[PDB]
Chain length 195, copies 10
């Protein structure tokens, strides 16, 4: 499966990019950070809200050197169709993020988010670094959408730790106190953090 | 093998509770959500902040029907000793959440967060409901603290969905619009939200 | 796998039936012939032309003790969506036949029509008798549609055969000749057919 | 283990080609679509209507660059013997199409049409293209014969789609409306087909 | 598979009996020795001569309490069809002995005579006793037909030793010298034969 | 084991060959037909008669190009000392046939005539052509002896076919009607054979 | 296979006993020591001497409560035959010890004396308890007969052992000094033997 | 598996007491000689002393027949040595003329097939092994009965004869007694001569 | 398969032993209610082993007083052991001895206690302290050329006796009368505040 | 595992060496005898007393050419933290011996002193020679500390036998008598040791 600290399972999927079919793979986005977010089913409820909120935030992630991909078990024909139904009617409308079509279930299987019985993916989201390792997993059960901002926090967070060697405290958003993870230089932080 | 919508690997761990040793285990919190967050290692850096920020926020979880257990591969003795070290010097000082000693690693193993070669757990956090099913999994690679508000949010979220049978869109917080997951009742939300 | 002369893999699948979801299964059509027809993809090209044709034909299968089921690897949400598109735009309109979501592949797999690497069923068509026995299989490669009248013809051929224990020459259509299948009795037919 | 989209099983069988024995293999009809049609038994009842029917249509099939091959698990001599009986009395008389002796059941086994229990092949028909890919399988249970016209229709179909790259709607015969298999271009078909 | 002194593989087989499909087992001829004879295939060359020969001798085998049975892997239709062609034409004409269709090859396999790759039996003849036990086996390659008389001899030979409990010299025929199979009594035979 | 049209199992066996011991193998007669004949036991009853019969017949076999060989599980010494015993007393007297000691049971076992529970070979007789190929098997249960004539027939029988590529009818002796194994030329036989 | 201190592999083997056939079996001599002795071949050279030497001593074993059996992969027939040949020739003429026909090789196999490749029995000999327990094994390569006297000695030794529960020194024979097998009692022996 | 006649005797390298001194012993220490390898159950017991002492008395006689007697038990070299250091009057061995092979780790005994596993001692197994390293004779006596020096001797001389002369020994053959020309024809020379 | 391990039941045996100049069967059972100090030596008739056996035999009364039985075991037969016994110490003999000698002729003791050099068929200098519940509380394994320590074995017996009885926990180097620790975080501090000025 | 007179399982483990972390391995002390002593837990009771004891003895272990290494299953951070706690308060204070962190349990597992169920090591201590061979193992159950003077006793002892090929009686200390391990020479010792 996909595991934090391990290489992200490799894939080439047909995807709806800018309203046309184009193959996508981690390579397509060297060496951006990749946010691969699975939804269970096109034409449903929680899912569109997520696709939308990430799409609306597509640029915020580009700013962070991140490319967010959405993955579904539906076909590209189904994903596409969904972008052709406007958002007022639960459609996705126009979308700035790729909808990857995981019709053969390999993505959802490899990413350990396939509910075999149902043949759909859990609300798994995966943050993958330019070295293609998985730095974060979020998996949600079906009824509750993930957090666009958390997703972003984490892209930012991991990008920081990658650039600075510094380690990031719980809730750190960029600008908050970061730690130096030696026993010595980490006093800087704890001394400063606790009045 | 701790996986969303399966039953949380069950357990019984010696833990540090209000400063003394105590057996902890899912059913010790019969009826409540539990937020089980592993941290790599006591006496480190991100981990204190996690424990603290979650300890400081204990009441808030407790107000949402959630109990929060933290966990490491350290013995309860190490953990207890960390508790006896002031936060100004990277200890935890007094805290309000149980610190489970996963000294034999079952807990980390069973939760799929154990870094075998390191013998510590990734920053895994699992929101386990009353019927004991895992409902959310966050796994952050080592260098990035997780985020208390999101753990809380998710708790509230699953609590909402468990209760109202309604589903909760991306970025939901109390009072944000919810959706009735049926083709014809969900239209309410979509018209209303225009997305 | 699904096999002629052998019992048809039973299923219980969720289906768009008359614009709402419904579980269909073989036994739901007690005493009826079911013709089960798989399709590669919703929102594509020959598939709808097949669904439409068979849907339009339904009554002619009704009069023949048969019930048509289409199935595909698509979710019932897609299928349903599909249904809500005008045929002019590649949709199926309203539709007189159930569409089985086989969103976990079980049905395509069990019927031996699943294309592993793709996740879609070949154009498989199974005529299953009221005894649950697969009396005929048709499988087309993807780019070529099936033949309503021949599905129909075959059902008739089997209804006829089951009821009369005569055997049906190449190309029989109701009212065409017929061979009582014994060395002594077939002469009857072979002598009328030649000279 | 003969599946649509895969390499029809190779074989080399003694056959009756024009009153004499002769090896035949897929390969003897390089370039031709082959339609390999199994019957259960020589000397029976619907079996000889299928051979006879296809034998009249040989010229028609030849004209579509198809070679028609019939197979059963009778010995070459039994098939030849069958050829030497006038059709008036259950016979085949002279025929135009080869009759493959599958005396050892390797063909019938290999094509998934052999009733192990009975040593006779089901009424399987395989349309194999010049690439040796199986394009369509018809399997009929014993008591109903196939349709010569549909073997033609589908030869003509797969030939068409190979040459033209347009996919073929349900019931398509040559001259019928085709579809250009892309989202944007299939609208051509859908607008015209739904006046 | 079938070995001498072991139980004969039992079977139920559609067969052409009296020109009409009958179901045929060893049971069918309880108490009868049976001569089960496998031929490669219908509409060929040695084979008709064999079944014809046997058909001809049927009553001679009946007289020795033996049922003759033929089997090939050809279907019953094919076998029946074979009976419909005159013998001058390589057909069988009427025959007095049943024709087991081993279309699924079980018989031929079970009996150790199936050429797996050809789907056809070697020329295997088997003499099976009432108790069910294979007592003789002949397997002829395809190119050479068997020996009716020889099968008769053997049926007669065991039909004897079954009842007279004595023992049949090489080339024995009804009325030739037998051997009392003990060290004491055999000396009779050996002395008289030399 | 050993089977008709499979190679004969090779061997070197010590044997009595005109009184002295001799190492005897299949290739000791390269180009000749071999008639391996298995008797149960030395100093028994049927078994000497067979040997004695085949001994006087050795002349005939040499003529039709055959080496006749006899074998038992009995030792070189038991066999040798069986031939020191005059035929008047259950012995063999001097003989022309090699007597093959299969003390270790490998001949009998390899030839499928070893009755394991008893350590004795059944009345097995294999005819092997010069290409090392079992042409004929006769296996006789113990109480009845074989047929020197029939052994001879079957040698003359196979020598012919080997030589003339014609196939011998039931009961064929030399200069009896023979057969051209073709659907055409075989008719010259069936005509001459029936009226 | 067979091992000292372990139960003797049992058997039912047809034998030549007083010139006729009988079944022989360890418990047929219940209460007797059984010296079972294997010889590679009938109509060879060392085997008869061993058989004769042992037959001639049959009486001597009888007196020590031991039954002597011989065996071989030859049939009861080859044996019987070998029995009908003057020793002059030889042997074995008439003998007083059963000859066991290990025609199927089971005995030899079980007793570990069977030369698989030959397959005859090595000159194994086994002295067996009235309790069915192997107490002695000698095995000789094919070219050297055994030693009847030694066999007798051994039978007597273990008859004594069993009876008395003292232990027998090297070369012991009936009458020879014996050992009491405890640290303290054995002194009297060693002291006396030097 | 184990030692069998006609089959090559399992090699061994074992520390042993030779002339009251530790030395390594192996079959090919006596390259050329027949080796008579004899197992005993236990140092300091009752039958064993005798057997060892016996073969040790007659060690020269075995040397004289191209043979080196070996004794082996599962005792250590120190037990065996210590045994040679208790006078025979008291239940001891030594001094002795034969080597005593310490099978401390049981490999010799289990290889020769004579180890009572539950007991960790060897059965009175004695092996006759030719200069080609082949087992020619096996004797296994249960514990309570000692073996026969003379029989061991006899059998050694028997196999020296046939190794050399190609003839075969009858039952009871002692050097000087009648051999047999091992052939159906030259055989009868012996059978006739042996009989009335 | 699985050897003796501290905090597991010492593998049971029943072994012929030399007990007071005569042969006797010995098991853990024979010592119901006693700590057993089971100690293996490689070989009767050697150099370090007798020193250890004599050392421990001299000390048996001191072990008996601590509620311990000492056993020795080797891979030698009971006949060599007894025979070793019957030799004076003056010449590397064991002399009369107060602790049983266990004959592990068939090696199961050695095997089960995982102290058996298989290539060699002798046991290592393994000493096992077994409590009355039958639990191995201590293992010492010395390589062959160094002998062990009666005092230590005795000390350890006393340590475990102490522990079982008192529920306190024993510092490095503790002998009866030395400071103990009560094994709780708050109560341990008693011991730590005292042992450090 | 790790057995006497076999090679000590090798390791590379992080260790607290004088306040800072360091990689420790056997071959870091090429030449020295290694006393590798496992403890069960940092922050407990017997364990410090042993480390503290061996720490004070450090120099006399080096004087005998040995290096003492302590190891537990705690992290480098626990160990060090313990080093920061004054000995008065249950801590370890400044120390002279390395503290190996066996967080992945491999060392413990390898030396066979890991109580799996607990994830802590028994008080195993190993004396490993400059050749890497374990010469002595002591394993104490948890409730009872080890003897520092005995550890030294035994470095010395082997340091002695290694150097001198003499052999050391029970309770040997430096300067006590020594046995020459040969039947003849040992007589000296025994003669000198008994009346």
């Amino acid at each position: 499966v996909a595991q934090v600290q391990k290489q992200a399972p490799t894939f080439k999927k047909t995807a709806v990019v800018d309203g046309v079919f184009d193959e996508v793979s981690l390579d397509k986005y060297k060496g951006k950070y990749v946010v691969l977010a699975f939804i269970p089913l096109a034409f449903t409820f929680v899912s569109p809200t997520e696709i939308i909120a990430f799409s609306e935030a597509a640029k915020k992630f580009e700013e962070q050197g991140a490319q967010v991909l959405f993955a579904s078990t539906d076909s590209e024909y189904s994903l596409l169709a969904w972008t052709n139904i406007p958002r007022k009617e639960g459609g996705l409308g126009p979308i700035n993020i790729p909808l990857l079509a995981d019709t053969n279930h390999s993505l959802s299987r490899d990413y350990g988010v396939l509910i075999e019985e149902e043949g759909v993916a859990l609300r798994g989201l995966f943050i993958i670094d330019p070295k293609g390792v998985i730095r974060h997993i979020t998996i949600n059960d079906l009824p509750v959408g993930r957090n666009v901002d958390e997703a972003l926090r984490l892209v930012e967070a991991f990008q920081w730790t990658d650039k600075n060697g510094t380690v990031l405290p719980c809730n750190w958003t960029p600008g908050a106190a970061t730690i130096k993870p030696t026993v010595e230089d980490s006093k800087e932080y704890f001394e400063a953090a606790n009045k």
